[PDB]
Design a binder for this molecule. Structure first.
Ligand SMILES: Cc1ccc2c(c1Br)[C@@](O)(CC(=O)c1ccc3c(c1)OCO3)C(=O)N2
Length: 521
């Protein structure tokens, strides 16, 4: 009713009565340039952040960081974590896959890419989605390969349905305030990697302030900038809640509300760093649908007892993750010889839109964040401060509140998957001990190699039976690998048509890595 307010006046309103008066002072009485940069930061990088609420978050999170957990019951979750476990369950997997494809066709699926991180650790000062792995004949960014996986899954859904309608997965790209513009530019310059512009939604997350432990004051990086840090993937809820321009222009609604109007039923969430990400996975989707789950998490067996990864647990009937620093944890089940706590968190989730909505509502009053003491660089020298994080898993305790009444068997499910098929995070520069681009590329090639050997062996049972058999023998004894474009195959399908060329190469002059791509690439 009082009309439009300047960005600065909105910031002033947001900081009034927030117990952070040193910031309010900077906004009201700082230099022109200081007032402006602080305004831009609080507006564009901390949009929606409730500063009073975060004082409570700091207080509680500090208290918490100063034994009820039980593992998932043996044999209680869907386990497809090896070749042998998948063989024994082949029909169930195929049936779930068909359910997932129907949902993709129906336009019910969104994929949310966590895209706030940079490639700085990889030696690349651009958003991580821009990163191009060496060692691949495809010269494609991580963003490009994600989009091609969506295109392929959409194409398969259409082939199964026979529908006249296009299968469309909504792509939600969760940027940072600082990297949003450059991310949109990259997509635009590349024609959205073959996607429709209308199915791609860019939305910026908010960072979280850092605090002095003794006083609870927000730390200043400099006179024009508060100390703030990426909040962790729990930022999704606030980010999906932010009002956006809405169409005839109407009152602003959230991306969440926009998705509900588009008929989205599930949101699959994953980090852009995962080279092996099974994007729009129809088995994951089919499992959620058939289980009537509001949350499904993907997990992997631990690599060994000392792997520094969080594991899923249930405590007092509530599901969550216990991080390696907080862990009985390394006990072995007597019968199987497997760790009792053996569902490692690979940050790959599928959530109902109802859950996304309810979790966001609950999170506004939620104060149990993860606090860490960190040395923080500032223009006045380093200081010790508190950083606060929250993760998707912190909200899973609310999952059964989505049903009235809750289901007897609950609405949370675990899907234990094969790590080497599903999880290859690109996090550390080549030459590091783990999670390097080369490590992820090795897993990718190993997976494609398995798919091609399988396709060749099926043909061994149009190409000549004996030539296919000979070609497989060449693959094995020469240790030939394959690299397969997602536009060709996302799960091992679609290779039959390529076998004449593959077989010719294998029998005449095999390269170290057979490259399979669409003719029009
Ligand atoms: C749904 C929602 C809408 C607005 C706000 C919130 C939520 Br949740 C907050 O309570 C939390 C917030 O913005 C926030 C911002 C970044 C985060 C984060 C939470 O978890 C880790 O990363 C908040 O302070 N404002």
């Amino acid at each position: 009713p009082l009309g439009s307010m300047s960005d600065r006046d909105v910031c002033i309103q947001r900081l009034t009565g927030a117990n952070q008066d040193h910031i309010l002072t900077a906004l009201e009485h700082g230099s022109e340039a200081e007032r402006a940069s602080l305004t831009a930061q609080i507006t564009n990088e901390l949009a929606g952040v409730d500063f009073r609420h975060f004082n409570d978050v700091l207080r509680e999170s500090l208290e918490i960081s100063k034994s009820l957990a039980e593992p998932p019951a043996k044999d209680s979750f869907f386990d497809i974590s090896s070749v042998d476990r998948r063989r024994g369950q082949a029909k169930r997997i195929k049936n779930l896959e068909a359910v997932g494809y129907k949902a993709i066709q129906k336009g019910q699926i969104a994929f949310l890419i966590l895209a706030g991180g940079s490639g700085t650790r990889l030696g690349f000062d651009k958003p991580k989605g821009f990163f191009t792995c060496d060692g691949l004949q495809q010269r494609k960014s991580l963003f490009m390969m994600h989009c091609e996986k969506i295109r392929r899954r959409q194409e398969i859904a259409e082939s199964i349905s026979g529908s006249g309608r296009k299968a469309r997965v909504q792509l939600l790209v969760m940027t940072s305030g600082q990297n949003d513009a450059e991310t949109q530019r990259f997509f635009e310059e590349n024609s959205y990697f073959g996607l429709e512009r209308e199915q791609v939604h860019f939305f910026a997350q908010s960072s979280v302030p850092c605090y002095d432990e003794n006083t609870g004051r927000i730390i200043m990086e400099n006179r024009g900038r508060i100390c703030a840090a990426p909040g962790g993937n729990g930022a999704v809820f606030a980010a999906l809640a932010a009002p956006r321009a809405t169409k005839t222009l109407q009152v602003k609604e959230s991306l969440l509300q926009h998705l509900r109007k588009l008929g989205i039923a599930y949101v699959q969430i994953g980090n852009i760093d995962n080279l092996l990400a099974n994007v729009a996975d129809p088995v994951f989707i089919g499992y959620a649908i058939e289980e009537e789950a509001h949350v499904v998490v993907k997990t992997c067996p631990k690599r060994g007892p000392d792997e520094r990864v969080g594991v899923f647990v249930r405590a007092s009937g509530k599901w969550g993750v216990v991080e390696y620093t907080e862990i009985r944890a390394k006990e072995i089940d007597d019968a199987t010889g497997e760790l009792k706590f053996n569902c490692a968190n690979i940050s790959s989730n599928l959530c109902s839109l109802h859950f996304m909505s309810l979790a966001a509502e609950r999170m506004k009053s939620f104060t149990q964040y993860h606090a860490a003491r960190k040395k923080i660089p500032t223009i006045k020298g380093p200081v010790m401060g508190i950083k606060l994080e929250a993760f998707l898993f912190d909200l899973f305790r609310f999952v059964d509140e989505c049903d009235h009444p809750p289901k007897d068997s609950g609405a949370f499910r675990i899907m234990q998957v094969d790590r080497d098929d599903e999880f290859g995070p690109v996090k550390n520069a080549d030459g590091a001990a783990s999670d390097t681009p080369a490590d992820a590329v090795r897993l990718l090639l190993s997976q494609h190699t398995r798919w091609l050997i399988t396709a060749l062996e099926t043909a061994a049972m149009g190409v000549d039976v004996t030539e296919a058999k000979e070609a497989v023998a060449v693959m094995r004894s020469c240790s030939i690998k394959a690299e397969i474009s997602p536009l060709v195959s996302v799960g091992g399908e679609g290779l039959r048509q390529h076998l004449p060329r593959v077989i010719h190469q294998l029998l005449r002059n095999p390269p170290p890595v057979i490259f399979i791509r669409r003719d029009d690439e």
